[PDB]
Each structure stands twice: as structure tokens, then as C-alpha cells.
Amino acid sequence: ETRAEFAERSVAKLEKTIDDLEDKLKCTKEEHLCTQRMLDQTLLDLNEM
Amino acid sequence: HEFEALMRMLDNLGYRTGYPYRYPLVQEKTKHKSEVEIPATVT
Amino acid sequence: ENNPEYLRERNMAPDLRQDFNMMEQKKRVSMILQSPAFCEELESMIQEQFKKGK
Amino acid sequence: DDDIAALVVDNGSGMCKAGFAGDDAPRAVFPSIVGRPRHQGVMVGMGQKDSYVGDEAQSKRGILTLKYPIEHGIVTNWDDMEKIWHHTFYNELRVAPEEHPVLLTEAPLNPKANREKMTQIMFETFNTPAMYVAIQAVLSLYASGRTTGIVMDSGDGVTHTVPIYEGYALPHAILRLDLAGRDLTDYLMKILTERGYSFTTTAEREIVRDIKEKLCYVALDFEQEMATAASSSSLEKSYELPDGQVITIGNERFRCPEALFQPSFLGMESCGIHETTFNSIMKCDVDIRKDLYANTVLSGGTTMYPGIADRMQKEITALAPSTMKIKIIAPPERKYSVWIGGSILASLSTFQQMWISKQEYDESGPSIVHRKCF
Amino acid sequence: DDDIAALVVDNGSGMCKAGFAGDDAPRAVFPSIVGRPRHQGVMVGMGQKDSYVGDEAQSKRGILTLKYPIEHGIVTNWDDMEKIWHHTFYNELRVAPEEHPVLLTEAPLNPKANREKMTQIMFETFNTPAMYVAIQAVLSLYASGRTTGIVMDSGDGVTHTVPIYEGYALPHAILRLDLAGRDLTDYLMKILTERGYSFTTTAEREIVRDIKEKLCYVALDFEQEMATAASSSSLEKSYELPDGQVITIGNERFRCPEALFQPSFLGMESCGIHETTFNSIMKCDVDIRKDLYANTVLSGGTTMYPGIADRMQKEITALAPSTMKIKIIAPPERKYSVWIGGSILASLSTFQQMWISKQEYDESGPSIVHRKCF
Ligand SMILES: Nc1ncnc2c1ncn2[C@@H]1O[C@H](COP(=O)(O)OP(=O)(O)O)[C@@H](O)[C@H]1O
Numbered sequence: 001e002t003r004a005e006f007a008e009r010s011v012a013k014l015e016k017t018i019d020d021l022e023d024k025l026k027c028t029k030e031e032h033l034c035t036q037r038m039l040d041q042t043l044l045d046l047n048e049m
Numbered sequence: 050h051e052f053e054a055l056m057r058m059l060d061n062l063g064y065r066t067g068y069p070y071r072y073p074l075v076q077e078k079t080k081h082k083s084e085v086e087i088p089a090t091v092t
Numbered sequence: 093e094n095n096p097e098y099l100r101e102r103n104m105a106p107d108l109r110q111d112f113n114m115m116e117q118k119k120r121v122s123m124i125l126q127s128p129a130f131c132e133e134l135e136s137m138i139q140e141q142f143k144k145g146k
Numbered sequence: 147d148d149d150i151a152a153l154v155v156d157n158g159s160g161m162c163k164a165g166f167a168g169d170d171a172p173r174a175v176f177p178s179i180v181g182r183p184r185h186q187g188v189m190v191g192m193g194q195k196d197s198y199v200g201d202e203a204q205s206k207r208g209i210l211t212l213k214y215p216i217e218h219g220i221v222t223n224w225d226d227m228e229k230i231w232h233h234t235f236y237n238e239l240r241v242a243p244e245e246h247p248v249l250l251t252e253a254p255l256n257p258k259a260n261r262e263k264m265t266q267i268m269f270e271t272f273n274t275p276a277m278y279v280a281i282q283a284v285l286s287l288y289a290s291g292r293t294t295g296i297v298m299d300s301g302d303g304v305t306h307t308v309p310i311y312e313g314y315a316l317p318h319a320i321l322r323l324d325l326a327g328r329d330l331t332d333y334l335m336k337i338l339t340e341r342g343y344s345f346t347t348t349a350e351r352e353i354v355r356d357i358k359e360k361l362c363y364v365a366l367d368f369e370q371e372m373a374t375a376a377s378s379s380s381l382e383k384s385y386e387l388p389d390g391q392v393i394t395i396g397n398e399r400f401r402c403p404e405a406l407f408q409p410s411f412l413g414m415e416s417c418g419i420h421e422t423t424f425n426s427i428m429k430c431d432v433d434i435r436k437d438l439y440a441n442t443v444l445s446g447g448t449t450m451y452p453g454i455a456d457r458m459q460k461e462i463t464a465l466a467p468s469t470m471k472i473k474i475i476a477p478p479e480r481k482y483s484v485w486i487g488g489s490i491l492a493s494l495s496t497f498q499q500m501w502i503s504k505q506e507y508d509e510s511g512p513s514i515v516h517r518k519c520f
Numbered sequence: 521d522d523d524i525a526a527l528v529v530d531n532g533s534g535m536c537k538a539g540f541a542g543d544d545a546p547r548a549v550f551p552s553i554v555g556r557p558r559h560q561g562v563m564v565g566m567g568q569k570d571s572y573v574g575d576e577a578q579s580k581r582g583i584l585t586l587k588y589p590i591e592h593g594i595v596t597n598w599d600d601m602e603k604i605w606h607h608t609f610y611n612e613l614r615v616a617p618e619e620h621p622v623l624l625t626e627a628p629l630n631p632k633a634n635r636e637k638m639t640q641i642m643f644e645t646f647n648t649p650a651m652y653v654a655i656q657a658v659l660s661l662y663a664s665g666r667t668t669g670i671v672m673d674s675g676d677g678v679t680h681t682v683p684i685y686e687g688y689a690l691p692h693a694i695l696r697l698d699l700a701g702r703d704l705t706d707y708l709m710k711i712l713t714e715r716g717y718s719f720t721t722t723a724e725r726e727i728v729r730d731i732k733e734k735l736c737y738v739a740l741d742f743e744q745e746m747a748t749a750a751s752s753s754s755l756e757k758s759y760e761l762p763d764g765q766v767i768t769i770g771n772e773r774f775r776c777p778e779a780l781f782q783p784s785f786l787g788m789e790s791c792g793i794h795e796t797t798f799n800s801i802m803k804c805d806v807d808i809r810k811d812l813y814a815n816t817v818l819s820g821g822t823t824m825y826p827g828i829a830d831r832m833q834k835e836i837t838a839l840a841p842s843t844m845k846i847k848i849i850a851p852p853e854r855k856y857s858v859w860i861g862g863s864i865l866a867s868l869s870t871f872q873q874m875w876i877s878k879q880e881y882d883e884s885g886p887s888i889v890h891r892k893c894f
């Protein structure tokens with residue numbers, strides 16, 4: 001029973017940390033998506049600038 | 050410009066259109082958050 | 093060792109006992125009541141839902 | 147309020163739970179069965195009742211014909227429900243019903259006469275001061291800490307999915323499906339007869355239900371798992387019967403819950419649970435779709451199979467639109483959550499206006515519950 | 521004779537029947553019994569054998585322990601099964617099994633491995649070129665002349681009702697009950713003890729089975745017939761034993777078959793055959809029930825009690841809705857009808873594609889029968 005109690009507390013803390021890291025992943029994807037679309041738009045414009 | 054609107058409208062109806070949108074549709078103002086939430090996802 | 097508190101305990105199925113222990117450790121009802129914002133928010137929800145009712 | 151706590155009584159189709167409001171744990175959880183003797187009793191002085199109710203009935207399974215008062219979420223024996231309520235109030239809790247308020251839970255879509263009959267029974271005989279009726283699926287979201295999201299519930303009676311939007315149950319988008327735990331137990335018998343093990347009486351149905359509870363899991367991929375089970379015997383496990391015999395379940399462990407996802411195994415023409423949830427979200431307006439995909443809560447007795455969470459996430463990802471926020475929020479105590487939500491709802495100070503007084507019922511008959519409780 | 525004709529073999533728990541393909545009548549019908557001597561044998565130089573098989577076993581009943589190799593439709597002693605099949609092929613039909621294909625019939629719901637065993641000892645030992653396995657009750661519908669209807673088959677070992685739509689059976693609606701003629705014989709032997717007559721050995725069980733076949737009938741109304749027997753003594757018949765004694769069974773004539781409709785006499789939980797086929801109909805779709813009521817076909821040895829059709833029709837009409845019409849179909853040769861269906865199935869030119877080749881079995885092992893036979 002005591003071993004199960006440790007494992008429960010560890011589960012709770014670790015899965016909260018998983019949610020934080022996944023939110024950071026989502027932010028990083030939308031940074032990719034903005035930079036990649038605007039680079040593709042620059043390629044489509046074909047402007048010497 | 051037009052083709053994205055057509056894809057978005059088909060997505061609203063329900064066709065699983067794989068066309069990637071260059072800009073987001075809605076602002077999605079942050080909803081009202083409580084601390085006593087069970088942390089989401091199944092990991 | 094004759095009181096009914098002993099009696100139901102050995103008449104417990106084991107898994108129900110262990111679920112009681114786990115949700116005893118978990119204490120969901122206490123957290124929901126102790127949190128101020130969500131408590132008064134759901135108070136407002138039920139209050140003006142009742143107000144819409146009659 | 148302070149002197150007396152409202153009684154929280156959850157009437158599930160398979161199990162019945164009861165406790166005091168404001169408490170973390172229900173005081174008594176017991177099966178909702180009533181058994182009658184089937185053999186002649188010849189011992190004069192040992193004492194035999196006319197019928198056994200609850201855990202006492204399930205202790206003597208061999209000499210009883212077990213009957214369920216609730217069938218497919220619909221009550222089919224009202225005096226039997228009077229017996230189960232009498233057993234709940236007097237034996238399990240040892241408290242009088244006339245001195246405390248009671249709280250009752252119900253299916254989201256039930257006939258009007260059922261609500262009227264529950265109110266009439268609870269006021270006329272038990273003479274309770276105050277009662278209230280709540281939707282079963284709503285209280286799970288209150289226990290979740292949420293006010294907006296989709297709630298999937300699956301008990302022994304019926305499986306239904308509802309959307310909730312700041313405490314509002316949309317009546318049009320509530321979807322029902324007849325894939326309960328009892329049908330899975332019957333299919334477990336139907337697939338167990340292949341190996342050579344025969345169960346036919348209502349006593350062995352509890353054994354088959356215990357086998358289903360203890361030794362089952364949900365396959366992430368069915369086609370790969372059947373080949374894996376055919377290739378090797380590492381998936382086989384042994385169960386030890388009450389009479390001492392040992393059975394080997396083997397292949398069927400991931401074949402019992404698969405009827406939830408593909409109802410064609412049971413002969414039903416309906417769609418799977420994932421398609422039911424997808425169509426339930428599809429029926430709502432566009433504005434709340436984003437916070438329904440981003441917020442899903444699983445509840446009910448059937449939803450504690452190991453591996454159901456990842457399979458549910460994958461199957462709802464396969465139907466969702468692209469780059470969509472998908473997450474499943476399953477609490478570990480997901481089939482005690484309705485009682486927790488009921489106690490939470492009864493604990494509030496602004497909830498005390500919901501109570502129906504005895505004078506109100508006496509003035510307006512049993513039909514006042516629908517006007518007072520919308 | 522010019523061309524090889526298949527052998528149709530119907531093998532139930534009670535008797536074994538064998539004949540040629542396309543024939544009107546089976547060539548051999550004999551009880552499925554293997555007897556072994558029990559008494560000391562001192563007569564040197566005359567005919568003694570270590571085991572007797574077939575009708576010769578029932579001829580010398582007084583010096584044997586009769587032993588049925590098939591129990592409740594499941595083969596439990598395979599050596600006696602091989603002896604029965606050897607006596608069928610060589611002593612009765614007198615044709616070698618290697619020249620001709622064989623067709624076997626089997627119960628709908630059964631242990632899986634039985635089919636494998638029926639494969640392994642048929643290709644390996646008898647060296648048949650091909651075989652096939654078919655469900656017993658489908659052949660009754662084929663022999664009756666109908667492609668759509670529900671059929672009850674209650675043999676000596678097991679009772680089962682299957683509904684078939686457009687000649688193509690429904691697996692989910694198959695209902696199987698372990699109540700047949702042998703349990704009726706045991707019940708008759710138990711209730712004949714109350715009058716004073718005692719029957720305890722195997723030959724006495726055969727005599728009691730003969731008594732049941734000679735003098736039994738099903739009452740149209742149980743209460744009225746019981747009161748009629750309470751009034752007068754016109755319901756008494758005298759049967760003469762092989763010893764020379766005369767017994768008067770009287771009241772027990774309609775009590776032995778009544779266990780078919782009220783299985784609470786034996787203590788079994790399951791209820792009678794009429795509500796069993798009613799539940800089998802109700803498990804099907806609503807649209808097809810109209811054809812299922814009008815095409816009910818009875819088959820099997822147990823369904824030859826006088827007055828079974830009227831009682832069955834009355835009970836199933838009491839259960840059915842009033843707007844629906846009920847038609848029972850009772851062939852005068854129902855006892856052999858399954859075999860007749862087999863003779864239909866071995867004559868079709870498309871059925872030549874159905875045969876499991878010996879080369880295919882050698883390639884795929886004994887598990888070819890699940891994928892080849894439906
Ligand atoms: N630990 C468990 N593992 C697997 N299945 C379970 C478990 N506990 C309960 N169940 C299933 O849940 C069903 C009980 O559901 P329940 O929560 O009583 O429904 P309701 O919501 O009507 O109360 C049982 O039939 C059982 O098969």
C-alpha cells in the first residue's frame with residue numbers, strides 16, 4: 001500500500017510536467033509555421049529587395 | 050485567397066480537408082481557468 | 093471486536109476498500125469547495141440558471 | 147445545513163452508492179440486485195427470508211434467482227425499487243429518511259412518468275422533507291472542475307454522450323447507444339463457449355463479470371493484436387474459479403471490449419462509440435467545437451478498461467479535422483465521480499433554493515418536479 | 521456406382537444414420553453405443569469379444585455396461601467414436617472410405633477443438649479424399665423446402681433454435697439449450713420411483729427410454745389435464761416389461777415431456793423451449809419477424825411427442841403480438857429430416873467447390889476447417 005502511495009504522487013507530478021512540456025511544443029510549432037509560411041511567401045514574391 | 054475560404058467552409062461542414070491554412074481564423078480569447086482542474090491529456 | 097465497524101470492514105469486498113483508501117487520499121470534494129473562484133463561479137451558474145427558470 | 151446533511155444517493159443501473167453530503171467518500175456501495183429462493187428449505191430453525199437484497203443476496207448466489215430492478219436504464223419493477231431504497235436507508239446507513247434531505251440522480255433522457263413516479267414514491271412513503279433530481283452526466287463535469295466540455299458516460303444500463311456549455315445540457319445533441327457492461331458480459335459468455343466453458347445461470351453471470359473486470363484490456367491495433375495472439379501464448383492468463391477449477395482466457399481478453407468500438411460483433415447496426423462522440427460534437431454549433439475537442443471527460447464504470455484512453459484518443463484523432471487540439475481527461479476515480487459531483491452540488495449555500503418542500507408537493511401533485519427542476 | 525457418390529453421415533448423441541448421396545433413404549440407422557462386458561465369462565471355444573458396437577450391443581443388453589461416446593452433443597471418448605465410425609463404414613455400408621467423400625453434421629455452438637479432432641481422425645486414419653461439416657439445423661430448413669425461417673432442432677443430446685434469413689444463417693441470434701431427450705429419460709426414471717418401480721442400471725435406462733417412446737404425450741393444458749387425471753382413471757396405460765411384469769404408469773405420461781416447457785422441474789434456471797424461440801426471434805430485426813413467425817419448423821427426435829405442435833403454437837401465440845400470424849411446420853418424417861437435407865447438399869453441382877481437398881488439409885493442418893467451413 002505504501003509503495004502504491006508513492007507511485008500515485010509521482011504520477012500526478014510527472015503528468016503535470018508532461019502537460020507543460022507539450023504546451024511548449026505547441027508554441028514551437030506555431031513559430032515554425034509562421035516563419036515557414038512567410039519564407040514561402042518571400043519565395044513566391046521573388047523580389048530582389 | 051478564395052481556395053482557403055472554400056477549404057475552411059468544407060472543414061466547417063465536416064470534410065477532413067488536409068489543406069494547411071496559412072493564417073489562423075479566430076483569435077480564441079483565453080477562457081476562464083480554474084486551478085482545481087485535473088491536468089488534461091492521457092500522455 | 094464485536095462492533096459493526098469491524099463487521100462491514102470484513103464484509104467489504106477488497107477492491108471497494110482500496111478504492112475508498114485511494115479516493116480518501118485523493119480528497120476531491122475538499123479541493124472543489126476550498127477553491128474560491130470556481131466555487132463562486134458555479135454558484136453564479138446555478139443561481140442565474142435558477143433565475144432563468146423562474 | 148449545519149445540523150443535517152443532505153443524503154447523496156446515486157442509483158446506478160448495476161451498483162448503488164449512498165453517503166452524506168460534504169463528505170469525500172460514500173458510506174455504502176452495494177450491488178443493485180434482489181434475489182428470491184429457488185429451492186425448498188427444509189431446515190426449520192435456521193431462518194429464511196422471503197427475499198434477499200444487496201450484498202446479502204450476492205453472498206448466497208447459489209440458491210437465488212438474481213433480478214435487476216433497473217433494466218436498460220428503465221425501471222421495470224417499482225416495488226423492487228422500494229425494497230432497494232428501504233435497504234439503502236435503513237440497513238446500510240441506519241438513518242431515518244424523514245430527518246434529512248435526499249438527492250437523486252437520473253439519466254439525461256428519461257420519460258416524464260418515471261420522474262413523476264420517483265417523486266411520488268419519495269414523498270408519499272418515505273416522507274422525505276426535501277428532494278432534488280439531477281442529470282447523471284452533468285455532475286461528472288462538476289466533479290471534474292469544469293463547466294464546459296463533452297461528457298461520455300457508460301454504465302450497466304446504457305452509454306450516452308452529452309455536451310455541457312457553462313452548465314447547460316443541450317437537449318438536441320445528447321446521443322444514446324446501447325453498449326453497456328451487461329452486453330459485454332453476455333458477449334463474454336458467447337465467446338467463452340468456444341474454448342469449452344459453459345455458463346448459463348444467473349449465478350455464474352457474476353463470475354463472468356468478475357472475469358471481465360479482472361482480466362481484460364483494449365487493443366491499440368486489433369489486426370496486429372490478433373496476429374500476436376495467434377503467434378505466441380504470452381497473452382494467455384489463468385483464472386481460478388470459486389469451485390477450484392482453472393480456466394485459461396487467452397485470446398478473448400481484447401475481444402470482449404472490442405464490441406464497444408465495432409458494434410457489428412453483437413449484431414447491432416449502430417455506429418461505434420468514437421463515431422457517436424464525433425457525431426455528438428458535429429451536431430453542435432461551430433463556436434463551441436474548439437472547446438469540445440480541447441475538452442473531453444470520460445466517466446462511467448465501463449471506461450476503466452486498461453488502454454481505453456490511448457485508443458479513444460487515436461480514434462477521435464482519426465475523425466477530427468487537421469491540426470486540431472485533442473485531449474482526453476480521464477480521472478482515476480471516474481466511476482465514483484457522480485456521487486462526488488452530487489455531494490459537491492449539495493454542499494453549496496445557493497443550492498438550498500433547489501429543494502422542493504413537502505407543502506409544494508402536497509399542493510401541486512407529483513408533476514411539480516418538472517416545473518421546479520428544469 | 522459408376523461415379524463416386526458421397527456418404528452422408530448424420531451423427532448425434534442418440535443414434536447414427538448413414539446413407540449415400542442423392543438417395544431417398546439412409547441405408548443404416550443404429551444406436552450410438554459401445555458396450556463392454558462386466559460379468560465373468562467361462563465358456564471357452566465360443567463367441568466372446570472385448571467390446572460390442574452398434575445394434576449388437578443393444579441386443580445383448582444383459583451382460584454389458586452401455587456407454588454413450590457422445591455426451592451433450594460433445595464427443596468425450598474418441599476411441600469409441602472411431603469404433604463407431606469403423607462399424608459404420610465397414611460393417612453396415614461395406615464401402616471403403618478412401619473412394620468416396622464424406623459429409624458430416626455438427627451442432628451450431630460447440631467447443632472449437634472438436635471440429636479439429638473431427639478433421640484429424642478423418643483424414644489421417646480413414647484416408648478420405650474430402651469432407652465437409654455443416655450445421656445440423658440448416659439442413660432441416662433445406663429439406664423442408666424453405667430458404668427463410670426459424671428452426672428448432674431438439675435431438676437426444678442438445679436443443680438449439682436458429683433463425684435463417686434468405687438461406688444464410690444469423691450467428692448472433694443462435695440460442696442453445698442443454699435440455700434434450702436423455703434428461704427427459706432420467707426425469708422419467710426419477711418420477712417412476714415414486715410408484716414403487718425401480719430402474720437403476722443401463723439396460724433399465726434403455727427400457728425406460730422405450731417406455732417414454734411408447735406412452736407419452738404433451739397436454740394442451742397442464743392444469744386441466746392434471747385435474748382430469750385427478751377426476752377419473754381413464755388416463756392409465758399398462759406396459760409389459762421384458763421380465764413379464766406389467767406396470768401401470770398412469771399420471772406420468774404428460775409429466776415427463778412437460779419438463780420441456782417448464783424446466784424448473786429439473787432445477788435448471790433456463791425456461792422452456794417456446795420462450796427460447798421467442799427470444800431468438802426477438803433478437804433478430806423487426807422487418808424479418810413477419811417471415812419468421814410464418815415459417816417455424818420443428819425437427820429432431822424429441823419433437824415427435826403427440827400434441828407437441830398444438831401446445832407449441834398456443835404458447836408461442838400467447839407470447840406473440842396479436843396482429844401477427846403463427847404457422848408451425850411439423851413434417852411427418854422430421855426425425856430423419858436433417859439427413860435428408862444432407863442428401864440435398866451432396867447433390868448440388870456448386871457443392872463440388874465446397875469440398876476440403878486432402879492436399880489442402882496436408883498444406884494447412886487441422887485448422888483448415890474454420891476458414892473452409894461456415
Ligand atoms: N475495476 C473495474 N474494471 C473493469 N470494469 C469495471 C470495474 N469496475 C466496474 N466495472 C464495470 O462497470 C460496471 C458498473 O458500472 P456502474 O458505474 O455501476 O454504472 P452506473 O453509472 O449505472 O453506476 C460493471 O458492469 C463492471 O463491468
Ligand SMILES: Nc1ncnc2c1ncn2[C@@H]1O[C@H](COP(=O)(O)OP(=O)(O)O)[C@@H](O)[C@H]1O
Nearest residue numbers: 532533534535675676701733820821822824825
Ligand atoms: N416417436 C418418438 N416419440 C417420443 N420420443 C422419441 C421418438 N423417437 C425418438 N424419440 C426420442 O428422441 C431421441 C432420438 O433423437 P434423434 O433425433 O435420433 O437424435 P439425433 O438424431 O440428434 O442423434 C430418442 O432418444 C428418444 O428419446
